[PDB]
């Protein structure tokens, strides 16, 4: 028969759709898993979707994924109450079976599921407490702690009067009665979590709003014979904006940094006023640009902007990245616009920070001295940079830092004798030629 | 203006001993509105 054929692979594919969805269920995938689950006929695979939740819960590989699982059940219970209605039934019987079996591993797997379902308003507080009364009727104390650690936050909110009575009997345990040792320190840890107010049992996937979950708080008790509907999981046979062309927000901010920068006496005062503002990290690249542009209105180098920038860098590392990004943004882009009166301010500015290790020597590796990748105003900037390196460090200490820099980009050492002839020609034109003793040995070997 | 400036105050008991550095700032001139009035030390290029 082809109708029995067509319904069976329909029953097969629905079983073969739900099982990889549950196995792929995790946080930040719940909404995408619930979407694809919704298009598969949940109501026909009513016990199929229930049994695939139960076995994926029970398997003991999970237990971690239970709050991901119970959040899907609340989504289902919000959409169709009958799915969470039947799935709460089986978990009651799965507890009562394994509690009678004394399978302590399988009980706690169900009890963590019943806890978080109560956290997600799937089930009533009545179904939780009567489990607690049965467990506390025996010892069963390893099971009941893992319940009350997770659900006691919500349960004391809802049913405080009876829940206080659960504590008071539970306090009579480790107070007037002798207990086994390893179980005992776990019970008093629950008393320790009580004073810490349950802040480590109250985190999960509250995706549904309290009015988006249709409130089917199922008031089933664990003394009810619960119909045990395994039969529907078998196969059967259905005969059935304004664009912003202006930057006036930036201009009012660019005015505020400039007024800070001119109202201060010393560089430590201007540094304190800029750090007082708590400038957001997207603007901290731009604040360095306001400082450097205001340093070029001064028409002479000042140590004010140096000790301003030094207190920026030692404050936090995001300022130090902002100066490192700006030094690349100055050399590769901004050199073409600057006049030669402004380049001697910058080369003395960046030479001051490099010579006192506020910027590393590895930032100098960006600068390359060729005929092609070198602008005539760029060579002026290198000249006023190295002079501040010579005046501060000396000609010998600068020789040591340039040797540890391995920035051949600057001084080559191999490759295109026309660049080695270029670089010796340029450095002697500055007046520092004592560094160029390495290149002259390399040059004559090529000859 | 020359006095809408945070004045460096740093530990007068130990400031006679060594150079402490600028560790704290005392307020220079107060008033409801926020001054920010520039001072001409920022407008006079120094001797060095």
């Amino acid at each position: 028969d082809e109708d029995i054929k067509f319904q069976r692979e329909n029953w097969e594919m629905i079983r073969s759709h739900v099982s990889p969805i549950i196995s792929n269920l995790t946080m930040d995938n719940l909404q995408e898993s619930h979407r694809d689950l919704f298009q598969v006929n949940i109501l026909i695979g009513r016990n199929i979707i229930c049994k695939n939740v139960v076995d994926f819960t029970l398997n003991k590989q999970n237990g971690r994924l239970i709050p991901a699982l119970s959040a899907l059940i609340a989504l289902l219970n919000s959409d169709i109450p009958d799915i969470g209605e039947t799935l709460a039934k089986e978990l009651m019987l799965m507890f009562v079976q394994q509690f009678n079996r004394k399978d302590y591993v399988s009980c706690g797997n169900i009890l963590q599921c019943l806890s978080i379902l109560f956290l997600y308003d799937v089930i009533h507080e009545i179904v939780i407490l009567q489990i607690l009364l049965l467990l506390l009727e025996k010892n069963s104390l390893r099971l009941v702690i893992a319940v009350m650690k997770i659900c006691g936050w919500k349960l004391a909110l809802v049913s405080k009067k009876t829940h206080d009575m659960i504590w008071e009997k539970l306090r009579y345990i480790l107070q007037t009665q002798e207990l086994s040792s390893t179980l005992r320190e776990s019970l008093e840890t629950l008393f320790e979590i009580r004073q810490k107010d349950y802040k480590s049992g109250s985190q999960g996937l509250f995706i549904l709003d309290p009015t988006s979950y249709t409130v089917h708080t199922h008031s089933y008790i664990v003394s009810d014979e619960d119909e045990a509907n395994k039969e529907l999981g078998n196969f059967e046979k259905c005969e059935n904006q304004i664009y912003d062309m202006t930057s006036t927000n930036d201009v009012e901010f660019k005015k505020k940094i400039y007024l800070v920068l001119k109202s201060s006496l010393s560089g430590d005062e201007a540094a304190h006023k800029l750090l007082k503002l708590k400038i957001a990290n997207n603007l901290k690249k731009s604040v360095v640009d306001i400082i450097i542009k205001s340093s070029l209105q001064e028409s002479t180098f000042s140590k004010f902007y140096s000790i301003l920038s030094e207190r920026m860098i030692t404050f936090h590392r995001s300022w130090q990245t902002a100066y490192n990004e700006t030094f690349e943004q100055n050399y590769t882009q901004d050199i073409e616009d600057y006049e030669t009166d402004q380049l001697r301010i910058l080369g003395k500015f960046w030479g001051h920070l490099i010579s006192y290790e506020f910027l590393p020597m590895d930032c100098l590796k960006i600068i390359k001295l060729t005929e092609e990748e070198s602008c005539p105003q760029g060579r002026i900037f290198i000249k006023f940079l190295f002079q501040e390196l010579v005046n501060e460090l000396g000609l010998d200490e600068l020789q040591l830092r340039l040797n540890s820099s391995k920035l051949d980009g600057m001084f080559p050492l191999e490759g295109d004798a026309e660049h080695i002839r270029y670089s010796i020609n340029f450095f002697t034109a500055i007046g520092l030629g004592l560094l160029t003793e390495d290149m002259r040995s390399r040059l004559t070997i090529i000859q | 203006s020359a006095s809408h400036i945070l004045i460096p105050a740093s530990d007068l008991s130990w400031s006679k001993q060594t150079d402490t550095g600028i560790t704290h700032f005392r307020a220079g001139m107060t008033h409801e509105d926020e001054k920010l009035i520039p001072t001409i030390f920022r407008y006079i290029t120094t001797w060095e």
Binding site: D268, L275, F315 | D11, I22, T23, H24, F25, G28
Partner: peptide, 27 residues
């Protein structure tokens, strides 16, 4: 707190005496 810094008083000082820690001086 008056940890050795600030003024004896803000009476004859013609300031408010408001002291705030230098965020620049840390290391």
């Amino acid at each position: 707190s008056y940890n050795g810094i600030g003024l004896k008083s803000a009476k004859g000082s013609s300031t408010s005496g408001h002291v705030q820690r230098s965020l620049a001086s840390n290391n």
